[PDB]
Amino acid sequence: TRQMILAVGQQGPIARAETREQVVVRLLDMLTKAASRGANFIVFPELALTTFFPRWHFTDEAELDSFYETEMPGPVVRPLFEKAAELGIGFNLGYAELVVEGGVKRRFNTSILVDKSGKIVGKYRKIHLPGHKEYEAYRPFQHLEKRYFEPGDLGFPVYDVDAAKMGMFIANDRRWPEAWRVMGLRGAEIICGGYNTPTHNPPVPQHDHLTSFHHLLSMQAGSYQNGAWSAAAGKAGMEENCMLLGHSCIVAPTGEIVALTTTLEDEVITAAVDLDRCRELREHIFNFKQHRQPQHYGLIAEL
Amino acid sequence: TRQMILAVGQQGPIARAETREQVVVRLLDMLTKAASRGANFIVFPELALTTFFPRWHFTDEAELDSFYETEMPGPVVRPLFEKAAELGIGFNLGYAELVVEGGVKRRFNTSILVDKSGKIVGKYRKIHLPGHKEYEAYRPFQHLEKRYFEPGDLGFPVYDVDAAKMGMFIANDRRWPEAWRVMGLRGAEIICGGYNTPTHNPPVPQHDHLTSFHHLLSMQAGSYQNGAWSAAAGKAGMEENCMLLGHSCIVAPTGEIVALTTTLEDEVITAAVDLDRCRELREHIFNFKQHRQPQHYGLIAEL
Amino acid sequence: TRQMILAVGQQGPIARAETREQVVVRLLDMLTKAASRGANFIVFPELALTTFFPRWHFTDEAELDSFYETEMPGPVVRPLFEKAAELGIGFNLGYAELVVEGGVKRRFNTSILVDKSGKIVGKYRKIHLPGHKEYEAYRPFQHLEKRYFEPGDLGFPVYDVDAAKMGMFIANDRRWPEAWRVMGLRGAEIICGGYNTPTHNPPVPQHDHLTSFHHLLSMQAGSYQNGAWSAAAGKAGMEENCMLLGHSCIVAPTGEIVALTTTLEDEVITAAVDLDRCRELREHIFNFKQHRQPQHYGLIAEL
Amino acid sequence: TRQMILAVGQQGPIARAETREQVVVRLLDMLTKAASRGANFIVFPELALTTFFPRWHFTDEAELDSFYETEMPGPVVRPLFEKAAELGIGFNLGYAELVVEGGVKRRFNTSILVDKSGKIVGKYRKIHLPGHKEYEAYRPFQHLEKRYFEPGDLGFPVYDVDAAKMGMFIANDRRWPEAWRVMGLRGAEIICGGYNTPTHNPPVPQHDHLTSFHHLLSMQAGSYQNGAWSAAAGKAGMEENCMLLGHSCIVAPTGEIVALTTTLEDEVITAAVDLDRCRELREHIFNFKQHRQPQHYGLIAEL
């Protein structure tokens, strides 16, 4: 087939004390409603199981570890996979991944793709870690991802998810044309991921009123230039006193926004997706093999 | 500190019978108007000295050649350079370049940067030739760029132009993130060029109503993701029965559009440009050294 | 209730020879798919039963009359109402209305609202007739609505349609703030209608590339300023050699576009609608009774 | 024929302790810069002579009064008028007006138009006072306009300013279609004003990320639907712990944005304005005499 209905499950805030059981309840509800609307795949936010902990400066490692998943899924998250298989609707779930190798802990900002059978068919680990590295007393909230996470070691892969070639990005990655391009070259038909974007940036507050503009601009250009459908799921609202951006969206391979959220709570949007639409770009104006000149792009790949 | 007034000189149509002498009078008029408005640099369109000849299939090589420049500047175009030096305003001029080397008549879609002293500071030759190589019957008007030009051989250079790092793109180039990124990586503070974009696309007519959108989307995303000011000068209006896109523009490093033409005739727009404003992006969210992961972009440079 | 799922059924072209039976087939299909996606109301285009005949200069009245409905519904259109009642989904259908009063024929560009029970609960007749009045030989297609239709005599009413207060506009009306305002004052929660908008305007072709911009601008401002959800259903594509605008849409009371079509064929888009969202505007920034100053708006109502 | 260069002088913050003498130096600087760029008229912000005092509840009437002008111009503001006449550039200046009539201390949020001769050509008093009348505890900062001003008593006039029909609006007014329409009906070719728009809205915080969108949406739709050029000068930046919206702009009669500020500081933008361009709308799609149906708008003018 080449037809499907894609959905985005935007999340409202997640409190520090809110349990994964409670979140799964909210997650289940969205997946159920999306399915009731015909969707066979739903995109969830970056780190969708917990509050955005990278905003705090940690000192107690046990504290930090508590925000990561040591298995996927665990007993508490399993019900999501079961419901996924039951209703026949895949999903993109973001979470904090903790792996212990030879006694050494490895941390990643992760996202996985589950097909409509309820099976994990791909994973991606955040490659572009935003923010600063050291505590900055002036900021009303920190952004210490470079500390609590290592740069993804999977590159930007593209997986087959129920007849659709899908690629993954996580939050900040969406702002990097390289991320989109690599997956575009790998033939992605859909490029999705979630995000936690504060509408306020302490180091550059003069860009606060452009938060939506910059986010939407990234999704539209990315889709357009790679002739791919895209979807972004944000966790929005006032979370732990930090206002997070909404405007979760689904974009056509022409860069046109076909669905957009308007609340700052859990919200489901859907859009019919024709995987062959990609050809309007990828076989003409952006027919890579016929127009690209990689012999002159070398600087982009230099270390 | 490090400020200037950038101008864009959009051209209205140029008829097949319109002479270069006549076109130069028009270019002189806009350059002068720009200077009277405080502009230190003005961006002119792609192939700004003649009608867009790539729309017709030529059988007479003598006739095809007439549309190319063998000198830059020649006696006819020279007056433009003199005015530039006189009024202290540089410019970016696009034209068809014909040069014989090693027994080969090389044809380039070229653009040059002249500083406010009237001196040619640097050149660029279109690398992404859009369209087709052979006459196509299903088209109401041709776009034989692949036939009339060979891909530029200068890469995507960035030159110093009156203490401003400027990079050049030509029409279709603006749609490629690779072009923008290479120059962004070279430190371009201003990225500019001209264009001839028919509002009708024979191959994919269902995108006709998106001509403007796709054009501005490319300029905005390019500027933003590279923290560079940008400007695009189009040649618009009904030229030889083919409508060309207007919306010539100047964009800030934030991707915000600061100036936009509203007519389809010769028109000058201007904007105050602060070269330090690039830092808001290039020293933060898009601080390449601190964020880019080139080890993962290799596929982009693969042949 | 205050929750519902609104849908728009965009139509591809309708040939002059295409029969109403064939159109109903297309109409039925969209209403069925919209219902399968949870929608309880679907908006259809202006004059959705026929080709846009106002583009031709008629001479044979029998010819002209053939494009109008003498009853609503007739045997051929009835199946739409039946399916509507069956699936529990109302709709907004536009059509050419022919009424014979005392031997005198009355013509209107009409639209009706059918609730989920399949009953007509309101009607509106186009008040702002666009175009010219006399044949203009230069135009590749005419726009003679002022001739084939009389100005609506129902004003801009607002009806109760299954727990939702809905108002109607037809094509061009959407460009007039007065139309939106009157219905906004009447408490409309949803303001919908369809349209036939050629992407080319013979008298002002310099606005062709702005066709989408102007259309979307009208829907967004209208919704925002009246704190109402809105939806526009277009009949798009190359119809009888005239390219018609797509970008059918659904807008939130904040002016945000929550759903947008991307093809130029029959296409269904949906969006969840919370009738209470209207309060965010109508009870605050646009709390009419608390902020408006009608004693100074007199000029708007003067004849 | 009938052309001019319109400028907008956006203000950065104005501290409570900042004196009028100091503010005037800033206004003189932008007016001069505008003239050097060929501008014949510059639009300044709402209450451009002091900080936005409506944000604080005052108990001392003497202190509240200090923020109002009793003369226009007074010795301190006079220098601005002299420069205007000298450089031949008119302006639109907003300030708090205090006038005693019939034993009443009348307080208006005012704006005046001065021609390029330094002569006050006309006045306007804000008719739509946003905010509230009594101190509200739930607000982080007040907006007591309803308390500190009474609705203007001059209606929405249109004056001749150096052969240009200009109408005035003040901040919140721009959001009301009635204000735009009244002046549109009066034949305004340019509709302009200033504003103080906090990017945070206590009553409806879920619209904070839409502050820019709503602002530009209002300017664009107003211009387009009335076929009028427009311009809005905002006072932006972090003023007294409250962030104010930037994005000061100039819009063509088509609703297209031709110039837009990018900083949150004092900034001058300009645009070439062709007063005849209004005809493209006012003599066609929006030819009022030929299209408006006032007999159906009565509710708009009802008290």
Residue with tokens 């501290």: D15
Residue C131 CA to its chain's centroid (Å): 17
Which of B82, B58, B78 shows the shortest CA–CA distance to B69?
A: B78
User: What residues in B contact C211, CB-CB < 8 Å?
Assistant: 209
Question: CA B163 to CA B160: how far, in whole Å?
Answer: 6
**Which residue of B5, B223, B262, B267 is the best one to mutate when testing the D interface, meaning the one whose CB has the most D CBs within 10 A?**
B262
CB within 8 Å: B206 and C243: no
Nearest by Cα to C191 from C173, C217, C212:
C173
CA angle D66, D67, D72 (to 5 degrees): 100
List the C104-114 sheet strands across, edge first. C120-125, C104-114, C90-101, C41-43, C3-10, C267-274
How far is the C-alpha of D89 from the C-alpha of D117, rounded, in Å? 7
Q: Given CB atoms, is B292 within the 8 Å cutoff of chain A?
A: yes
Residue among A209, A245, A263 whose CB faces D246 most closely: A209
Tell if the CB–CB gap between C262 and A258 is shorter than 8 Å. yes
Task: Tell me the C-alpha distance between A167 and B80, whole Å.
Answer: 50
Select from B112, B233, B91, B219 the least CA-distant residue to B162: B91
Q: Which of D282, D150, D172 is nearest to D232 (CA)?
A: D172
Chain D hits for A210, Cβ within 8 Å: 212
Where are the domains positioned within chain A?
Answer: 1-303
Q: Give the sign of the dihedral formed by CA B159, CA B161, CA B165, CA B166.
A: negative
3-state SS, residue D100:
strand
DSSP B75: T
Q: What is the dihedral of CA A44, A48, A54, A56, to 10 degrees?
A: 140
Tell the burial category of A51 from Cβ atoms under 10 Å away from its Cβ (0-12, 13-18, 19+).
Answer: buried
Burial of B105 (0-12, 13-18, 19+ CB in 10 A): exposed
Q: What is the CATH number that goes with domain D1-303?
A: 3.60.110.10
D225 in C contact zone (CB under 8 Å): yes
CB atoms within 10 A of CB C137: 6
Which one-letter amino acid corresponds to residue B285?
Answer: I
3-class SS of residue C69: strand
List of residues 6+ apart from B51 with CB closer than 8 A: B13, B14, B15, B16, B18, B239, B240
Say whether C259 and A259 touch across the interface (CB within 8 A): yes
Which residue from B minimizes the CA distance to C247? Answer: B209
Q: Find out whether A54 and A83 touch, Cβ atoms under 8 Å.
A: no
Contact A179/B260 with Cβ under 8 angstroms? no
Answer whether B211 sits within 8 Å of C209, measured CB to CB: yes
Task: Determine whether the interchain pair D260/B256 forms a contact, defined as Cβ–Cβ distance below 8 Å.
Answer: yes
DSSP B222-271: HHHHHT-EEEEEEB-EEETTEEE----EEE-TTS-EEEE--SSSSEEEEE
Q: How large is the C-alpha radius of gyration of chain D?
A: 18
Q: The tokens of A219 are what? A: 């999704």
Mark which residues 163-222 of C lie under 8 Å from D by CB.
175-178, 180-182, 185-186, 201, 203-204, 206-207, 210, 213-214, 217-218, 220-221
Resolution in A: 2.2
Q: Would you say D98 and D105 are in contact if contact means Cβ atoms under 8 Å apart?
A: yes
> Using a CB-CB distance cutoff of 8 angstroms, which residues of chain C are in contact with residue D177?
177, 180-181, 221, 225
Q: CB of C265 within 8 Å of any CB in chain A?
A: no
D266–B contact, CB cutoff 8 A: no
Cβ atoms of C183 and C225 within 8 Å: the answer is: no
Please say whether the dihedral angle defined by the alpha carbons of residues C81, C87, C90 and C94, taken in this order, is positive or negative.
negative
User: d(Cα D260, Cα D239) in Å, to the nearest integer?
Assistant: 21
Nearest to A1 by CA among A113, A161, A118: A161
On whether the CB atoms of residues B94 and B76 are closer than 8 A, the answer is no
- C-alpha Rg value of chain A to the nearest Å: 18
Identify which of B130, B220, B285 has the shortest CB distance to residue A217: B220
The upper half-sphere exposure of residue D101, i.e. CA atoms within 13 Å in the direction of its Cβ, equals 8
Q: What does residue B174 show for φ and ψ, rounded to 5 degrees?
A: -55, -25
Contacts of A72 (CB under 8 A, 6+ apart): A95, A97, A112, A120
Q: CB–CB of A8/A41 below 8 Å? A: no
- Angstrom CA distances, B133 to A291, B55, B109, C30, stand at 12, 12, 15, 42
Strand partners, A124: A111
Q: What is the 3-state secondary structure (H, E, C) of chain A?
A: CCEEEEEEEEECCCCCCCCHHHHHHHHHHHHHHHHHCCCCEEECCCCCCCCCHHHCCCCCHHHHHCCCECCCCCCCCHHHHHHHHHHCCEEEEEEEEEEEECCEEEEEEEEEEECCCCCEEEEEECCCCCCCCCCCCCCCCCCCHHHHCCCCCCCCCEEEECCEEEEECCHHHHHCHHHHHHHHHCCCCEEEEEECCECCCCCCHHHHHHHHHHHHHHHHHHHHHHCCEEEEEEECEEECCEEECCCCEEECCCCCEEEECCCCCCEEEEEEEEHHHHHHHHHHHCCHHHHCCHHHCHHHHCC
Query: Under 8 Å CB-to-CB from B275, ≥6 apart: which residues?
Result: B2, B3, B4, B164, B189, B190, B229
Q: How far is CA C283 from CA B67, C200, C226, C279, in A?
A: 64, 40, 11, 5
Chains that touch C (3 or more CB pairs under 8 A): A, B, D
**Cβ-Cβ contacts under 8 Å for A299 (sequence gap 6 or more):** B181, B182, B185, B186
Q: Which residues does chain A have within 8 Å of residue D212's beta carbon, measured at their own beta carbons?
A: 209-210, 213
> Cα separation of A104 and A161, whole Å?
32
- Which residues in chain D have their C atom more than 2.5 Å from the N of the next written residue, marking a break after them? none
Task: Please tell me the distance in Å from A156's CA to the nearest CA on chain D.
Answer: 31
| CB pair distance less than 8 Å for C258 and A262 | yes
Residue C260 DSSP SS3: strand
CB neighbourhood size of D276 (10 A): 12
- Interface partners of chain A (CB pairs < 8 Å, 3 or more) are B, C, D
SS3 D95: strand
Which of A293, A302, A303 best probes binding to B when mutated, by most B CB atoms within 10 angstroms? A293
**How far is A122 from A115, CA to CA, in rounded Å?**
9
Angle formed by the axes of helices D177-185 and D211-226, to 10°?
A: 20
Question: Residue D271 in contact with residue D38, Cβ under 8 Å?
Answer: no
Residue at token pair 């709570």: A265
Query: Six-digit token pair at C67?
Result: 């494009």
Give the DSSP H/E element, type plus range, for residue C184. helix C177-185
A206 contact residues in B (CB cutoff 8 A): 280
Nearest Cα neighbor of B181 from B213, B152, B158, B215 is B158
Which structure tokens are listed for A218? Answer: 């990234």
Packing angle, helices C177-185 and D177-185, rounded to 10: 140
CA nearest B257: which of B207, B211, B222?
B222
